mmCIF file with all atom_site columns, C-alpha atoms in Angstrom:
data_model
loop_
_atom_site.group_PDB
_atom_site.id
_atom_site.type_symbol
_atom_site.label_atom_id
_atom_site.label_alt_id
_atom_site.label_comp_id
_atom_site.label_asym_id
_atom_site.label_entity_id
_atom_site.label_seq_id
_atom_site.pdbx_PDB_ins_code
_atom_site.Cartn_x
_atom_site.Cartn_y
_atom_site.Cartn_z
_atom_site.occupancy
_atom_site.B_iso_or_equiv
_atom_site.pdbx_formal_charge
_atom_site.auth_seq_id
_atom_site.auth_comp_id
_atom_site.auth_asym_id
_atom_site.auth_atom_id
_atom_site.pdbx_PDB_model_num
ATOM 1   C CA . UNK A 1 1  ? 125.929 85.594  83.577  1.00 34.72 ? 235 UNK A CA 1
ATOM 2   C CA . UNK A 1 2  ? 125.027 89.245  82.678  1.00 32.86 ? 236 UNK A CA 1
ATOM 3   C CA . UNK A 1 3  ? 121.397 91.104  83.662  1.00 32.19 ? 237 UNK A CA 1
ATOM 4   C CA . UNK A 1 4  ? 120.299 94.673  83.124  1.00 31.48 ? 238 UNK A CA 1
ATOM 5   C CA . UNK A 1 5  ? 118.476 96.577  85.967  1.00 31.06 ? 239 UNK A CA 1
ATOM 6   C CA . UNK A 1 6  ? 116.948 99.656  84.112  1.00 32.64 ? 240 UNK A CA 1
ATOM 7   C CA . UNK A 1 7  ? 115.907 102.105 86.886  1.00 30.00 ? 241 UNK A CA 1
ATOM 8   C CA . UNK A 1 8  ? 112.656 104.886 85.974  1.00 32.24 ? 242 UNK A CA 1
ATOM 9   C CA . UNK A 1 9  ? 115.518 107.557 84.740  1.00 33.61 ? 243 UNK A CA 1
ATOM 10  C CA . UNK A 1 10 ? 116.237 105.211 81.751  1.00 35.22 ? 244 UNK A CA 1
ATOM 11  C CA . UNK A 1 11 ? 119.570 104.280 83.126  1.00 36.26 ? 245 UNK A CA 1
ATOM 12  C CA . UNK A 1 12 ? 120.448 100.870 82.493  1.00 37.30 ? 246 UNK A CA 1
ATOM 13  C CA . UNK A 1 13 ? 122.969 99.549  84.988  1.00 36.75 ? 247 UNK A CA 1
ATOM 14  C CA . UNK A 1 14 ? 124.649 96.088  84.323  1.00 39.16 ? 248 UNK A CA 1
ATOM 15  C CA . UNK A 1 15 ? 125.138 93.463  86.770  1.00 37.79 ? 249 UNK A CA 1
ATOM 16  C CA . UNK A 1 16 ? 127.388 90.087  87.059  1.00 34.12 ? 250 UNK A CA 1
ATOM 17  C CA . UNK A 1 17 ? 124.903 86.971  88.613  1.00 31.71 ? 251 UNK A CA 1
ATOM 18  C CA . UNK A 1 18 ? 124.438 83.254  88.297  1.00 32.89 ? 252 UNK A CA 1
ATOM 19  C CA . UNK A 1 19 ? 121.082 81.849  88.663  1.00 32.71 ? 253 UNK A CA 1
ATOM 20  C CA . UNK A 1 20 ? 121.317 80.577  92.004  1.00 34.06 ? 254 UNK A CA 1
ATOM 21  C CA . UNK A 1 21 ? 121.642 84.027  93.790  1.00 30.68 ? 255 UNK A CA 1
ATOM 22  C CA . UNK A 1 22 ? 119.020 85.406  95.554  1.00 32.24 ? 256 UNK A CA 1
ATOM 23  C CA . UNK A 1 23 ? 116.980 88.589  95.030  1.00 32.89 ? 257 UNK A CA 1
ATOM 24  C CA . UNK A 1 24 ? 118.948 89.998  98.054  1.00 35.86 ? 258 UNK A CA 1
ATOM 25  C CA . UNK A 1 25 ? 121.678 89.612  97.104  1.00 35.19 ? 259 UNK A CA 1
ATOM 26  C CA . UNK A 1 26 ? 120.938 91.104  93.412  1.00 37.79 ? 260 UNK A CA 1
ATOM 27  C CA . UNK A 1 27 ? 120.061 94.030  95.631  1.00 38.31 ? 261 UNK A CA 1
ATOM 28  C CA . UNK A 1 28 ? 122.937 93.635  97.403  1.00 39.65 ? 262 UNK A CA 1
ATOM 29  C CA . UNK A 1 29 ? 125.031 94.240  93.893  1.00 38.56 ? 263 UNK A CA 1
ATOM 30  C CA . UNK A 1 30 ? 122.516 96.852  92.863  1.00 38.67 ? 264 UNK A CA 1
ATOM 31  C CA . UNK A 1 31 ? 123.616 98.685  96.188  1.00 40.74 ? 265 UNK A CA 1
ATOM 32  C CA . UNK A 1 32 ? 127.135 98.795  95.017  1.00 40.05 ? 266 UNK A CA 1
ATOM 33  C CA . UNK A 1 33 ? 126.754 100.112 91.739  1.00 41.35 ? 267 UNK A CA 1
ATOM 34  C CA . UNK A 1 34 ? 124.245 103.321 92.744  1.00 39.98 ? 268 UNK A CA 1
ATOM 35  C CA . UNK A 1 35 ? 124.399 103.459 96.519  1.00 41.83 ? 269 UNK A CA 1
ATOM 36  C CA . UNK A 1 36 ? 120.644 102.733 97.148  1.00 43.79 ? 270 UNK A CA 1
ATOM 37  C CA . UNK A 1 37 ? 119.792 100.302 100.004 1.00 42.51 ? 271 UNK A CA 1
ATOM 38  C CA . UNK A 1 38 ? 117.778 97.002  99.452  1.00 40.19 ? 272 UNK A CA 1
ATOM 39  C CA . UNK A 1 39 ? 115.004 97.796  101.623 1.00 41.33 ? 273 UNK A CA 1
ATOM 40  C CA . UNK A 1 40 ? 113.837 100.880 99.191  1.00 43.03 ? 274 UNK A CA 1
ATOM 41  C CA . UNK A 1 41 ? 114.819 98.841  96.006  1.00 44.85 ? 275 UNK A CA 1
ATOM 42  C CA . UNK A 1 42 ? 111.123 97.007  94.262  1.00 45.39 ? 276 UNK A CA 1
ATOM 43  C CA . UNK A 1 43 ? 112.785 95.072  91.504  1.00 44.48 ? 277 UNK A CA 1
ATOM 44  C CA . UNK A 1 44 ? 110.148 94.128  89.018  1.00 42.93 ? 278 UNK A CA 1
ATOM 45  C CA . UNK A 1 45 ? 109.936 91.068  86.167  1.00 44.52 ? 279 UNK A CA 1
ATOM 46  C CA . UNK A 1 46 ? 106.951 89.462  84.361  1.00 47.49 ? 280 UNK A CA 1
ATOM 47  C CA . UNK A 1 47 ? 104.444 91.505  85.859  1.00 48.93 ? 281 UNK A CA 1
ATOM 48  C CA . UNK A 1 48 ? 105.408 90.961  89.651  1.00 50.03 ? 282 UNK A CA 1
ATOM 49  C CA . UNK A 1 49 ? 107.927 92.416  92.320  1.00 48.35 ? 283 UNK A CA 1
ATOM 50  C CA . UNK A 1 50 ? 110.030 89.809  93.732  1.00 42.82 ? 284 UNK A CA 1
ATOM 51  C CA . UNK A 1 51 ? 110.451 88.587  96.579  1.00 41.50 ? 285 UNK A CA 1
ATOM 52  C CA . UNK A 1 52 ? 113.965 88.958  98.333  1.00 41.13 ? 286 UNK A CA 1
ATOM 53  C CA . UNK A 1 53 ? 114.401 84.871  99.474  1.00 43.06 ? 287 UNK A CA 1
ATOM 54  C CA . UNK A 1 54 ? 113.527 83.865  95.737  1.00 44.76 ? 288 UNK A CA 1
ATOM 55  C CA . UNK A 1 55 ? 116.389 83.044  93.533  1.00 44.29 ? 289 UNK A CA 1
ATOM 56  C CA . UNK A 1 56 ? 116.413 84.448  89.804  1.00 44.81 ? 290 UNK A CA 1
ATOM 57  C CA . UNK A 1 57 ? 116.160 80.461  88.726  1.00 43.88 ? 291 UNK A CA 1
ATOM 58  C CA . UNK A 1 58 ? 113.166 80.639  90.764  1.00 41.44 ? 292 UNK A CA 1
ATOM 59  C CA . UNK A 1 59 ? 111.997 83.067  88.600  1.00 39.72 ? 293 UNK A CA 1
ATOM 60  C CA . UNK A 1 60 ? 113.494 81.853  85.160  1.00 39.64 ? 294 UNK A CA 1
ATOM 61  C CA . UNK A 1 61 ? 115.086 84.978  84.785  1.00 41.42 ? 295 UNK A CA 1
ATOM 62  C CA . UNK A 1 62 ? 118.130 84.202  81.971  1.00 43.29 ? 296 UNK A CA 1
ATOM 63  C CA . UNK A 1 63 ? 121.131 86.208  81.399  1.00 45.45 ? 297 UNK A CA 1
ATOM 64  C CA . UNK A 1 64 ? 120.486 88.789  79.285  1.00 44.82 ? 298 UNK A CA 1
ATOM 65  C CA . UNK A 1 65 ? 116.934 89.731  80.951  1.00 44.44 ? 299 UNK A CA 1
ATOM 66  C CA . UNK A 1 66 ? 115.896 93.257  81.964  1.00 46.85 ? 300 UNK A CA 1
ATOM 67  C CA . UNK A 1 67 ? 114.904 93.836  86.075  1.00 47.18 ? 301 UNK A CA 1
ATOM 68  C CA . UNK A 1 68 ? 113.046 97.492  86.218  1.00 50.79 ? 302 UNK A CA 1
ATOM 69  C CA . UNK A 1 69 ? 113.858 98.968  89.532  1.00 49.68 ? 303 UNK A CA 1
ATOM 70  C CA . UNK A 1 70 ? 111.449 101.442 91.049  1.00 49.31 ? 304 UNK A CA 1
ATOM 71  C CA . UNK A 1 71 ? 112.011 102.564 94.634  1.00 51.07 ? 305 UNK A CA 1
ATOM 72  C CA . UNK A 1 72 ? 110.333 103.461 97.525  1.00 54.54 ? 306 UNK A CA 1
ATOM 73  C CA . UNK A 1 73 ? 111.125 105.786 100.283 1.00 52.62 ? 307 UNK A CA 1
ATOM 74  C CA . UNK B 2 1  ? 97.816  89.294  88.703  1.00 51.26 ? 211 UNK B CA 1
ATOM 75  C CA . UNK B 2 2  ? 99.721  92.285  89.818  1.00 49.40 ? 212 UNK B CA 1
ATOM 76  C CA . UNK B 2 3  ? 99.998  93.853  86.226  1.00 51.16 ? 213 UNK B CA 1
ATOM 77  C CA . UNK B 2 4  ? 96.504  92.916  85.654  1.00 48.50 ? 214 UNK B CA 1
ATOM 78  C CA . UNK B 2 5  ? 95.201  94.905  88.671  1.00 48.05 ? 215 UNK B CA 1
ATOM 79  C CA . UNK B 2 6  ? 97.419  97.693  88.241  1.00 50.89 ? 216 UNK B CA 1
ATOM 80  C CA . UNK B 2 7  ? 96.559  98.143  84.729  1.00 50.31 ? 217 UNK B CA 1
ATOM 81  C CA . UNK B 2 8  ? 92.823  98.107  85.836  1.00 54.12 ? 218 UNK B CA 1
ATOM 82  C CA . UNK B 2 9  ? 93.748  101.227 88.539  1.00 52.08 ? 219 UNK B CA 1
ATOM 83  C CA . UNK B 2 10 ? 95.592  103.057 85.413  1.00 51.61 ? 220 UNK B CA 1
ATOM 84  C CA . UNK B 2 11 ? 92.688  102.455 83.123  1.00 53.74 ? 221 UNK B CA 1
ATOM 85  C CA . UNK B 2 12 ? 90.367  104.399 86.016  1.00 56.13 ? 222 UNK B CA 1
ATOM 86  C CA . UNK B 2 13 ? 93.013  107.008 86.217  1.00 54.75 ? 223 UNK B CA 1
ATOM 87  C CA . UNK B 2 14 ? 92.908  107.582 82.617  1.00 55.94 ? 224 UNK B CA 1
ATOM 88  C CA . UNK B 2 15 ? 89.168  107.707 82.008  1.00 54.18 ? 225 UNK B CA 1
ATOM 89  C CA . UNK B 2 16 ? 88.778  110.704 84.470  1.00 52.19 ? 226 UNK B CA 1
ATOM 90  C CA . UNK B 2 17 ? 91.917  112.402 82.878  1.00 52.98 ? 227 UNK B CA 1
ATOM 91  C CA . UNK B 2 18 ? 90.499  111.975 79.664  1.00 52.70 ? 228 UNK B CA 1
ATOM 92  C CA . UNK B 2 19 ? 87.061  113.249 81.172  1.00 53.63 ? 229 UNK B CA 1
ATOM 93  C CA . UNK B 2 20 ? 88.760  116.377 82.509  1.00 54.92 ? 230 UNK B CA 1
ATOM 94  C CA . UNK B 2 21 ? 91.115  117.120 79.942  1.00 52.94 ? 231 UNK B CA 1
ATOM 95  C CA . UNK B 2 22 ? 88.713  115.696 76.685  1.00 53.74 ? 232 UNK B CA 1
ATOM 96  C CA . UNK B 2 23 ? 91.405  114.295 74.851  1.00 53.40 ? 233 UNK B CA 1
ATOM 97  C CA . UNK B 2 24 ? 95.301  112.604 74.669  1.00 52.16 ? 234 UNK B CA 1
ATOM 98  C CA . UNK B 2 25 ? 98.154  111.826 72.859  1.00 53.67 ? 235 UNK B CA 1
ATOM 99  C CA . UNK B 2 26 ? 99.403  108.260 72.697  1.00 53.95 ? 236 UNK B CA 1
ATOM 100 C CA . UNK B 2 27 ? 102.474 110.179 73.699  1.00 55.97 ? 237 UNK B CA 1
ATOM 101 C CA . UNK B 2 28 ? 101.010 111.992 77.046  1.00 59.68 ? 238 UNK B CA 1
ATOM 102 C CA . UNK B 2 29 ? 99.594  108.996 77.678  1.00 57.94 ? 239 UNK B CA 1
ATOM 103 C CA . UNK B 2 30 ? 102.733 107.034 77.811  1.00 59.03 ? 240 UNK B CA 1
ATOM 104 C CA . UNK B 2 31 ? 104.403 110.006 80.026  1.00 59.35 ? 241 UNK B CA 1
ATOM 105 C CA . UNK B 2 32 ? 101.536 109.551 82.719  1.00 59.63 ? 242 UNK B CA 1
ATOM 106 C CA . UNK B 2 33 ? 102.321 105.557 82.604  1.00 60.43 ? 243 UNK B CA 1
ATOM 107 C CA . UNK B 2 34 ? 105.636 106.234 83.467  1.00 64.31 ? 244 UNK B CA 1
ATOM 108 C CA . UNK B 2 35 ? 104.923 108.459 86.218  1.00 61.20 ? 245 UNK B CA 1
ATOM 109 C CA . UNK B 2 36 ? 102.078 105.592 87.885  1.00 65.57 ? 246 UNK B CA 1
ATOM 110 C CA . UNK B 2 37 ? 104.787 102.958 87.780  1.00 66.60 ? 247 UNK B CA 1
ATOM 111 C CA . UNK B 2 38 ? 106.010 104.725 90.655  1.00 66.80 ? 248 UNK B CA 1
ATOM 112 C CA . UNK B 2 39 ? 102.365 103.847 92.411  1.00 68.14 ? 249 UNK B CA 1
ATOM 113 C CA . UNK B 2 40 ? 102.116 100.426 91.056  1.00 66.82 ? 250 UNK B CA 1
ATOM 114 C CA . UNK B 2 41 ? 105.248 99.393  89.808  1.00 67.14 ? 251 UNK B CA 1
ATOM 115 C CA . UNK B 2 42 ? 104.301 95.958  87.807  1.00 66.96 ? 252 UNK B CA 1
ATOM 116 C CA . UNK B 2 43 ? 103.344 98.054  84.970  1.00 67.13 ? 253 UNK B CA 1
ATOM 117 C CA . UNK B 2 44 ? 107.401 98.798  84.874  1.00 69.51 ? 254 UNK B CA 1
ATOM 118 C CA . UNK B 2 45 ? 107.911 96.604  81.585  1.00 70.00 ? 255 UNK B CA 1
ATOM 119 C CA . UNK B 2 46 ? 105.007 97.976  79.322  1.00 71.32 ? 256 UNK B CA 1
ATOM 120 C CA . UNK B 2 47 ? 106.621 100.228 76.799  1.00 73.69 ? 257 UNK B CA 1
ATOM 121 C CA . UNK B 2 48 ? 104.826 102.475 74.110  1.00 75.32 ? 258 UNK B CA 1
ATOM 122 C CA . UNK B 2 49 ? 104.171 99.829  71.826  1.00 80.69 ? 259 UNK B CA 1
ATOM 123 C CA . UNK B 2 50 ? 102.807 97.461  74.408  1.00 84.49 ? 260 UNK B CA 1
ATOM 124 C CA . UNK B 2 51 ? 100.571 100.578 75.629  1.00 82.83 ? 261 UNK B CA 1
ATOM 125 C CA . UNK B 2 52 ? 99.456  101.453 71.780  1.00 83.59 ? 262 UNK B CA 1
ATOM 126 C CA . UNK B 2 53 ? 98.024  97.785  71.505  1.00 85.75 ? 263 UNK B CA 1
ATOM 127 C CA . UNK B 2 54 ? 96.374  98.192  75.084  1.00 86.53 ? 264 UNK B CA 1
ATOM 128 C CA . UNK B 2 55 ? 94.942  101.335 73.925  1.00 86.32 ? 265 UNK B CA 1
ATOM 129 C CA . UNK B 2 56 ? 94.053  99.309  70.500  1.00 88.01 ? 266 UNK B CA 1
ATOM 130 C CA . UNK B 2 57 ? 91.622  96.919  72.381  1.00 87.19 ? 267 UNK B CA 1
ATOM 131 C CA . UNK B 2 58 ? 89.790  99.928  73.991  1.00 88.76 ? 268 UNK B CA 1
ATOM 132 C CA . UNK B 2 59 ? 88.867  101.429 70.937  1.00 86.80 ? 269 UNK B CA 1
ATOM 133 C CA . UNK B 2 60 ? 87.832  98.168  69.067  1.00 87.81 ? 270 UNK B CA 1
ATOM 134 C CA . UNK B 2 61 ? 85.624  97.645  72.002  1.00 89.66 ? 271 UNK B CA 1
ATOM 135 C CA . UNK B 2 62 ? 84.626  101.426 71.878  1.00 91.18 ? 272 UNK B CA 1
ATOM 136 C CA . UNK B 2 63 ? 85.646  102.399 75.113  1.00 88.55 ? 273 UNK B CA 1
ATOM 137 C CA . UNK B 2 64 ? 87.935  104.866 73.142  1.00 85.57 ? 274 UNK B CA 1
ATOM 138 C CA . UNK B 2 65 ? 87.814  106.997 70.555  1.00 85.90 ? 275 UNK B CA 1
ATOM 139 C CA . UNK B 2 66 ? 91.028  107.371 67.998  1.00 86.06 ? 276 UNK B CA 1
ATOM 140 C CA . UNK B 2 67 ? 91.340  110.245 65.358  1.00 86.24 ? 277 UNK B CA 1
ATOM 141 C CA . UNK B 2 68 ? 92.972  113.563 64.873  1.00 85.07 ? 278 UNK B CA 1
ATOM 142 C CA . UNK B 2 69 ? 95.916  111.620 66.914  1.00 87.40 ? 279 UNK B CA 1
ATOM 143 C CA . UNK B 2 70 ? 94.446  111.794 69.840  1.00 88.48 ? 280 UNK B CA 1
ATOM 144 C CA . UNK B 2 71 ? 91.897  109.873 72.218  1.00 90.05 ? 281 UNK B CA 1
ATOM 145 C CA . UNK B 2 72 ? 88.578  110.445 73.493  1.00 88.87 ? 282 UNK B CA 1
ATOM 146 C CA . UNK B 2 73 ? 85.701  108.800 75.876  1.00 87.15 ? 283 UNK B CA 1
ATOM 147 C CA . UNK B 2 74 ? 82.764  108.414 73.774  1.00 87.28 ? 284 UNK B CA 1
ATOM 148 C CA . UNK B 2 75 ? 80.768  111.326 74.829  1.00 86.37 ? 285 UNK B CA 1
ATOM 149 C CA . UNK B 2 76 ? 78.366  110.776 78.324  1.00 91.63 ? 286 UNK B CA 1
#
């Protein structure tokens, strides 16, 4: 299934999932498409950051929902 | 929880803005949202319309002042 990651320059990245992988390893893919590593990557949904063992079913995150990614250092 | 608390921090930010600078755009406003996401990031999803009826509630409790398109504290 298909989510959007839009980081705090507006740019919307796309990424390929299924509901059973893990915030990691969303990371993971997010690493691949911009080069940033998963320890400075805060994904946010519904109000909260999420936590990297956590699935996106976990987090009844469908296809077609938006992740914001703001980083830290 | 998280957005609650951080919205409560941005409303405090704003207030002494407002106090220092008198008054604001919904627009300004909305630029110094995006740049506190970066301090408290569960405000990420609010966009301007979300911020516009946030703002709304302030000034129907009279917290804020709206005309001339801009905002105000009541004066203190």
């Amino acid at each position: 299934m298909q989510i959007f990651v839009k980081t705090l320059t507006g740019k919307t990245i796309t990424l390929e999932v299924e509901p059973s992988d893990t915030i990691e390893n969303v990371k993971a893919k997010i690493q691949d498409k911009e080069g940033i590593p998963p320890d400075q990557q805060r994904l946010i949904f519904a109000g909260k950051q999420l936590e990297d063992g956590r699935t996106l079913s976990d987090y009844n995150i469908q296809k077609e929902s938006t992740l914001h990614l703001v980083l830290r250092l | 929880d998280q957005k609650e608390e951080e919205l409560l921090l941005f409303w405090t930010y704003i207030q002494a803005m407002l106090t220092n600078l008198e008054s604001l755009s919904l627009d300004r406003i909305y630029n110094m949202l995006r740049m506190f996401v970066v301090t408290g990031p569960a405000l990420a999803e609010i966009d301007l319309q979300e911020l516009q009826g946030y703002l709304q509630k302030k000034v129907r409790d009279q917290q804020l002042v709206y005309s001339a398109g801009v905002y105000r504290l009541p004066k203190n």
